[PDB]
Amino acid sequence: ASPQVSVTLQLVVDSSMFAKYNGDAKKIVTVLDTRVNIMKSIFKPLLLLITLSGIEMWTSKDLITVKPAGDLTLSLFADWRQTLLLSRILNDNAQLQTAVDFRGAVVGLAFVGTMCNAKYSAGIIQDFSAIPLLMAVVMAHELGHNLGMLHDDGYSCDCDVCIMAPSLSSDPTKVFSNCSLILYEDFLSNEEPDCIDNA
Ligand SMILES: [Zn+2]
Secondary structure: OOOOEEEEEEEEEOHHHHHHOOOOHHHHHHHHHHHHHHHHHHHHHHOEEEEEEEEEEOOOOOOOOOOOOHHHHHHHHHHHHHHOHHHOOOOOEEEEEEOOOOOOOOOEEEOOOOOOOOOOOEEEEEOOOOOHHHHHHHHHHHHHHHOOOOOOOOOOOOOOOOOOOOOOOOOOOOOOOHHHHHHHHHHHHHHOOHHHHOO
8 A cells, every 4th residue: 555556547438338428439539438437436445546548439339248247248348458459558456447237236356366467457347327436446446456355344344434334335435444555565566567567
């Protein structure tokens, strides 16, 4: 929670979301920038800078089949990042934004402790709320998992409305619990993600 770090984050918008926004690229950009700006505030306490490497919009076609089965979609998306995106756009992590309603109550998915990893530094997000704060918290929860964070034990940790709560609160805080901070310190210490510490 203290050395100065930076994550070059690439966002990807699928066909369904592109259509949901009436195929308006300017509208979509403004929407995601608002969310990313809140994500920047969420990570500020950890001295982790979030920079967008780009927002890729699949205006003509989906480069993977976006399936309601989140698990499958995350796997497909992570692989596509590995084999296709990274050959064109260097980035530390990519996050898919889709209007596809995942089965069940899942509105986001990511691999845990994989930040910087060529095959698994990825996450997926269902565009489930129009409120900037709620979507930024959703995006930050997935990036937090990528950064080695587990879910908050709502009783044990010093916060029950923070980023890593297992379920998104109806009215969330931008704050990380003490537990989340300790997990991030452990990730840095034990996992040593070189890509966020570079120059
Ligand atoms: Zn989670």
